[PDB]
Amino acid sequence: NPSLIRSESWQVYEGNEANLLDGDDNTGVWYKTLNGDTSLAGEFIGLDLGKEIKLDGIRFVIGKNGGGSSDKWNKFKLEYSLDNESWTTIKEYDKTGAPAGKDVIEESFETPISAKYIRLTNMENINKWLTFSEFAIVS
Ligand SMILES: CC(=O)N[C@H]1[C@H](O[C@H]2[C@@H](O)[C@H](O)[C@@H](CO)O[C@H]2O)O[C@H](CO)[C@@H](O)[C@@H]1O
Ligand SMILES: [Ca+2]
């Protein structure tokens, strides 16, 4: 199955990283960010798919309840890659000021997309730590 990949600098504050692949929306992880409690544009969390599989969709749940429920990116992108070096943006997002809590980013790909790595990436500095809950693909 797909394995988790994320910005190496993050530190787990509460929960576990395996909670992001257990299929339960109500289990997640709270990551401490460095750089003065700031997630820089360009930081990321996603999946290494193993080989070049063709995807029909993704379902990513960001944020979580209680602790760090408001600790989410404002601006981010969904991007994919073949080599973990060059990336292609599928879609950008701006959810500045949206309510704290879980948020299910769910995308279906009209034309299937050929990828080895698929992730969410920050596009604007934010003075916050980060919560997430689940990451899944659809083929
Ligand atoms: C656990 C928590 O409160 N996390 C905060 C985080 O807090 C830092 C620090 O800024 C703060 O003064 C103390 C107070 O206990 O806790 C630390 O752990 O601050 C960041 C940035 O504001 C929040 O995103 C995060 O939720
Ligand atoms: Ca989960």
From Swiss-Prot:
Compartments, record wording: Secreted
Show the taxonomic lineage. Bacteria, Bacillati, Bacillota, Clostridia, Eubacteriales
Task: Name all F5/8 type C domain ranges.
Answer: 1-139
Q: What is this protein called?
A: Hyaluronoglucosaminidase
What stretch of the complete protein does the chain hold? 807 to 945 of 1628
Which residues are connected by disulfide bridges in this protein? Answer: none
**Gene symbol?**
nagH
Recorded family membership = Belongs to the glycosyl hydrolase 84 family.
Give the function comment from the record. Answer: Putative virulence factor which is likely to act on connective tissue during gas gangrene.
